[PDB]
């Protein structure tokens, strides 16, 4: 609110039509922070057009990488938030931070699993078990990487075998399906298959289809 007797403030601060961002303890912030126009890049001294330390800079249509965080900047030099389309792919950036999404995420009551802003396709572990995040158009015109209805059915993907119960979640552990015993690994829900596996200090032989030989 107030200023200082070098200048200090709190929050987003305009000085001679340059943008700066202060933390509530009056210290200047370097990074991507939210202002009234969106998230901006408050850059270290001398990153573009001889910008002063902590000044928001021109930075257009390109990614930005700070620490282990990824951002995407549009034409107006603000970081995309939410769903954005970069070279034909849909990425997602957290609205609160502008940082790329990672892990399990619900968005408009739809479930996705993100790596570096990108929805991954495959079988991953959400809070309610392993779901099938599927290619686009697999079931009920779903979007790329969206968890889909998948009931009482096997799935082959990336040379692995999964079985999905009535709740569209992948089963884990010892299972009996149509008279056959499988063991789906708790870590990945992948069937043990095509040879010999140690399960709980015991070797078993599993066929290529993942069915345990008695």
């Amino acid at each position, epitope marked *: 609110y107030f200023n200082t007797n070098s200048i200090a403030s709190t929050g987003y601060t305009i000085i001679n039509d340059k943008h700066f961002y202060f933390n509530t303890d009056g210290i200047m912030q*370097i*990074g991507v922070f939210k202002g009234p126009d969106g998230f901006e890049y408050f850059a*270290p*001294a*001398n*990153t573009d057009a*001889n910008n002063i330390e902590g000044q928001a800079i021109r930075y257009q249509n*390109r*990614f*930005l*990488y*700070l*620490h*282990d965080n990824i951002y995407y900047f549009g034409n107006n030099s603000k970081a995309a938030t939410g769903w954005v389309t*970069i*070279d034909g792919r849909r990425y997602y950036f957290e609205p609160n931070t502008a940082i790329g999404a990672n892990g399990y995420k619900i968005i408009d009551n739809k479930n996705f699993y993100f790596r570096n802003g990108l929805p991954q396709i495959g079988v991953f572990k959400g809070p309610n078990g392993f779901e099938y995040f599927a290619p686009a158009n697999t079931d009920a015109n779903n979007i790329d990487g969206q968890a889909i209805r998948y009931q009482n059915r096997f799935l082959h993907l990336l040379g692995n075998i999964y079985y999905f119960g009535n709740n569209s979640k992948a089963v884990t552990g010892w299972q009996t399906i149509n008279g056959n015993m499988y063991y789906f690994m708790p870590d990945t829900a992948m069937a043990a298959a095509g040879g010999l596996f140690e399960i709980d200090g015991v070797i078993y032989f599993f066929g290529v289809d993942g069915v345990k030989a008695p």
Partner: nanobody, 123 residues
Framework: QVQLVESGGGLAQAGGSLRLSCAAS????????MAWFRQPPGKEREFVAA????????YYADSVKGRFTISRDNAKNTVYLQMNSLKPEDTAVYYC????????????????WGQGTQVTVSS
């Protein structure tokens, strides 16, 4: 005003091991990923290694895994490439880059580049 200056090059021999340095000046890179590329002679510039400022994220070209190691000291604003188990193919000019802005770190889209320094491996 901003420069990335490579050093530590020169001649080595098979199985041996060099250590390259890239000192950066004109701005702080303490937040930026840094990377090493190389250009064999006749062949065109190619990716070697890249890392985040924290060290937590690093990527390596297939032909280099286990043998080369990227690291840095943000206090000294410098990135390092530690090249062990050297081979004839490793002979190239090595450039450091900083501040990638492409869709991934393998792409030669980086805001700053060093002039590069020669590395030569014998027999």
């Amino acid at each position: 005003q901003v420069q990335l200056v490579e050093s530590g090059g020169g001649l080595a021999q098979a199985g041996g091991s060099l250590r390259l340095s890239c000192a950066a000046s004109g701005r702080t890179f303490s937040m930026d990923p840094m990377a090493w590329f190389r250009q064999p002679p006749g062949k065109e510039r190619e990716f070697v290694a890249a890392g985040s400022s924290t060290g937590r994220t690093t990527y390596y070209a297939d032909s280099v895994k286990g043998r080369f190691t990227i690291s840095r000291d943000n206090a000294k604003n410098t990135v390092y490439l530690q090249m062990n188990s050297l081979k004839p193919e490793d002979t190239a000019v090595y450039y450091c880059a900083a501040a990638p802005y492409g869709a991934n770190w393998y792409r030669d889209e980086y805001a700053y580049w060093g002039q590069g320094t020669q590395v030569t491996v014998s027999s």
